[PDB]
Assembly symmetry: D2
Homo-oligomer: 289 residues x 4
């Protein structure tokens, strides 16, 4: 049976969960990588059944979402040596161990073997609520460290543990290509680098492992992280539902099925791409009223 | 049960056929639209089992094979010279409008539309030496044809229905050899894919995309100018994936593009070319 | 002194004029190609000094010739347009004819400008456009650029330069810019690349296109499309300047100068930066 | 008379120097920011008239260039408070002071007044010789701090000290948009962020200061930096000279004159842009033989 590691799921409200669901539709088992400060919170809501409501696969619990494992993961660190004394001291990291990208890499591979799929649905900006102009070297590089370099780290450590013909997917946002005031802290710069890095990784992973990698430029989803920004997320959504060529409402599962498709053998000739999943809003010049 | 009309198949060596195959895999019934000057030959091949080897997916279910000339929007457009032409006389209802009426009357609303046709008489000429008539014909048969298909079919299409066409990267990067305004036609078709996505999306909740395919030894590709053998070899040498590109590779992306699983994708140019388009140039 | 041929000026309220003006600042002489059905009126208003207002800085106009970019050479003109009152007074107006006429009188020129479009169904949506309307938009607005280059480039100086004007509805959906015009503009930008390859290798001639913002030109005024677009550009572009005919003109002048001799095949945005925005910034 | 501050320059073999030259012929006065480690040498080269021939502009001989001033500048530091101790006690800096970004900006405003023009021609990355996949987070983030964030810091520190309608330009390279093996260390990512940043900065500089920013995507130049990587640069120059639509050799003043134009009021309505000065190589699909 096939497996996909989904780095960056903190609850059932994000894109990673939506991706997990659609992979369930085609019988691949999911391993989540959870950011440590919310790892217990999560494994708790999962034990109690708060997500059973969300593990329904359209045929209503005749088919379940197979969560093979859940692990602590801080893609901010590539291996143990990188971990600083203080984060080892933190009350949220005391309990937990083996959570560097290499740690979870090795762990999964030592137990489950080679896997086929790999998802990167995480990101973080310290100063996301600052304009790129008012952003500091530290915040900027933090955004980029957490949101861009993290994909590279994942590939480096995972892709030698993956099946030939395997596939990697990440999420991005169009602020990398067109100015969205409000998407700040160098998050636009991070996405811009992610997109570029997707191509360059496609070449190395393609030639070395025959592995594919693509990124989905998603439309606005009211996830937890999204919510953070005086409701920048509500505006992007009402702007989208109003002016997209497709007046539908965007679901996590819309991105979910495109990821599932990108992760399958059905797209074995597509690599290095930014595929837009935003109800066609990227094609528009502006509001059509 | 879902139906797709595939305009632009004349044998089993091109992309239309590969898309048909992949659509059969998910139980989609296929109607072929066939250029009349090649129609009776294609039907004979079919009838005598030449394509049987190539029908194996069990086997592809061809619901119908109709004559279609994507240069004619309706009956009145058809000149007498072709109405009197050896290869059209016995054939009727081959306007874009007439086959859309035909198909609609015989089967009702369809859900999927495939455009996989192109034509340009001066593709041997550099753009620079291409004539106004060559250039315009290339754009008439390869770009306008797409708008007309949509204009005539999309009244007769199920909401949430989907349209895909084929393109080539010659539109965005200079490929010498790809002439007669074919590079211009592909360009217009990519832009047109956008604009139709707005009108088709708002009006009928219909999606339209285009696949930028890599090189494939189709009969058309072969008729160009040794050129395609060079493009195939260059692709298999320098793509990120060194796999060999198959019609079914484009086929499965089209199928995905023609299904509700991509119901938030529209107006897009998708590259199915083994990653070739991301490279700067040769890596040796 | 260097010469620039500018096709697509029927008045002074457009981009072609702005390009002339800015070129005049550089001591480059200028030839106008004019759509015959307005050549008689243009020459008159130029007679009466009606244009002396805008000509000043002085714009030295070498010649004004009737040019119909619908016809590539003499034999393409059909019986009917020959027998039309709009043209009657005028001959030698095919792309080839004015190219020969210009070379015979002046020799090789250094600069070429394409600033003309037309389509007869620009009023209809792309989906509502017909084959003949669509193909007309493309013939006039797009192929013509290739016909100019084919005919003028053998008569140009090694190191010569060509520019045309385009609009962003080729890359992003602009309802209102219909009739296959978005379509013609998409071709034009692509063609700018392929042309750059051939012209560059064959004659060392560069070619670029400018993607310009809204201007209240004559042609723009028949669509209230352009009024809407100017308000939108002035409200949401990164720069608040009102866009000037001569802003495009000044980038043009640059592109036609040896100061840009490493730039070719490009689409250059001269639109106060508007292209770069996701949407209205309120 | 207008003044331009040119960041990355150190020997007249590069593009910073080429921009200097072409601004010169427009009678603009030029100031050099120079990386401290190479600063003493550059001034000893210059005051001994070694670049005396490179300062010549038609008419020749001659009509020379005249450098208003030359400062030390480490664009990897935003303000004094940043510059650490190890570096305070480094053989190259114990001899220099006021080289932080804000330090040099303040020094210039004080002494010269507001300036019209700003040029970013600086870049650096410790691990460029590594493929993106094999690149560490430190090397990667270094590439991006020095090569990209610099553009932002400069802009943050100079914008209030700049004339209304002032212009800024940086240099990029197509490896950000198409895979260029050999361009490792996260430089490709750096340039992608840079290009994206150019757009975002154009929004903020344009609204708040009526200030323009563009970047130039240049073709290969046998500069000192490009020399470092079995000659990546010789291959790239040859490739370009063979296959570009225009067969000429590309000179630092080719980019210099495009920059001078972008830095002048002739490009009044051009901002946010990536402009290609590469003899058209960017447009070709591949080798046309
Ligand atoms: N939501 C949208 O509107 C939208 C649009 C386009 C793209 N995206 C992208 O989709 C992806 C998923 O975002 P989402 O909206 O589902 O957010 P989310 O809040 O559902 O998921 C983000 C998760 O990443 C994890 N994370 C944060 N920092 C981490 C770190 N340092 N190490 C390891 N894990 C960390 C957190 O556990 C968090 O739950 C992100 O990359 C985002 O940029 C989102
Ligand atoms: N083969 C490749 O390498 C390649 C690569 C990229 C894109 N494409 C595109 O894929 C599409 C399919 O082409 P293909 O390579 O399968 O070639 P093909 O020869 O298999 O198919 C082209 C079809 O169009 C038909 N046709 C021509 N003129 C017509 C008209 N006026 N009306 C109706 N039909 C007409 C031909 O009979 C033929 O069946 C084309 O648009 C082509 O441009 C092909
Ligand atoms: N005005 C704008 O807002 C705008 C924006 C972007 C691009 N453009 C482009 O700039 C160019 C100039 O247009 P404009 O806005 O200055 O309008 P304009 O009226 O100044 O230019 C149109 C010119 O083309 C001429 N013309 C029409 N058909 C012709 C033919 N068959 N042969 C020769 N000439 C013909 C007209 O007589 C007129 O002189 C066009 O290519 C246009 O698409 C304009
Ligand atoms: N050389 C090329 O082929 C080429 C092509 C396209 C773009 N570029 C870009 O143009 C710019 C100039 O490069 P070049 O080719 O002139 O190389 P160069 O070596 O001539 O110039 C680079 C300058 O940056 C300086 N520098 C290095 N680290 C610095 C730091 N931490 N702080 C401040 N300054 C620092 C160097 O000392 C040098 O003066 C670079 O950004 C480069 O990426 C170069
Ligand atoms: O990428 C996103 C795009 C949008 Cl429209 C909404 C939310 C997104 O996700 C994030 C945005 C900023 C930060 Cl700091 C972290 C995350 Cl996960
Ligand atoms: O688009 C194509 C791209 C490639 Cl690489 C090969 C063949 C292609 O298809 C055509 C090319 C020219 C003409 Cl006249 C007709 C068609 Cl169908
Ligand atoms: O290209 C243009 C773009 C804009 Cl915003 C405004 C006017 C334009 O110019 C034209 C538009 C349509 C037609 Cl039929 C002819 C011309 Cl000259
Ligand atoms: O960007 C460049 C592109 C090219 Cl083709 C050549 C040199 C370049 O400049 C650099 C390349 C690498 C590093 Cl580490 C630093 C610099 Cl300044």
């Amino acid at each position: 049976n096939e497996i996909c590691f989904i780095a960056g799921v903190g609850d059932s409200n994000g894109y990673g969960w939506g991706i997990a669901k659609e992979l369930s539709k085609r019988n691949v088992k999911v391993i989540f990588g959870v950011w440590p400060p919310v790892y217990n919170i999560f494994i708790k809501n999962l034990e109690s059944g708060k997500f059973d409501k969300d593990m329904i696969i359209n045929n209503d619990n005749s088919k379940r979402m197979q969560i093979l494992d859940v692990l602590p993961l801080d893609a901010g660190f590539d291996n143990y040596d990188d971990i600083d004394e203080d984060t080892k001291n933190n009350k949220r990291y005391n309990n937990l161990k083996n959570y560097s990208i290499e740690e979870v890499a090795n762990l999964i591979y030592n137990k489950y073997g080679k896997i086929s799929m790999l998802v990167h649905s995480l990101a973080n900006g310290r100063e996301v609520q600052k304009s790129l102009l008012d952003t500091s070297r530290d915040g900027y590089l933090d955004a980029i460290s957490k949101s861009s370099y993290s994909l590279i780290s994942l590939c480096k450590h995972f892709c030698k543990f993956m099946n030939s013909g395997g596939s990697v997917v990440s999420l991005t946002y169009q602020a990398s290509q067109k100015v969205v005031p409000g998407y700040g802290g160098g998050m636009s710069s991070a996405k811009a680098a992610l997109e570029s890095d997707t191509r360059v990784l496609a070449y190395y992973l393609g030639r070395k492992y025959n592995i594919r990698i693509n990124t989905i430029s998603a439309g606005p989803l009211k996830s937890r992280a999204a919510t953070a920004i005086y409701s920048f997320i509500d505006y992007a959504i009402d702007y989208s539902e109003k002016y997209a060529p497709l007046k539908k409402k965007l679901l996590s599962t819309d991105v979910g099925s495109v990821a599932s498709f990108l992760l399958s053998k059905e797209s074995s000739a597509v690599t290095g791409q930014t595929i837009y999943v935003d109800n066609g809003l990227n094609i528009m010049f502006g509001p059509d009223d």
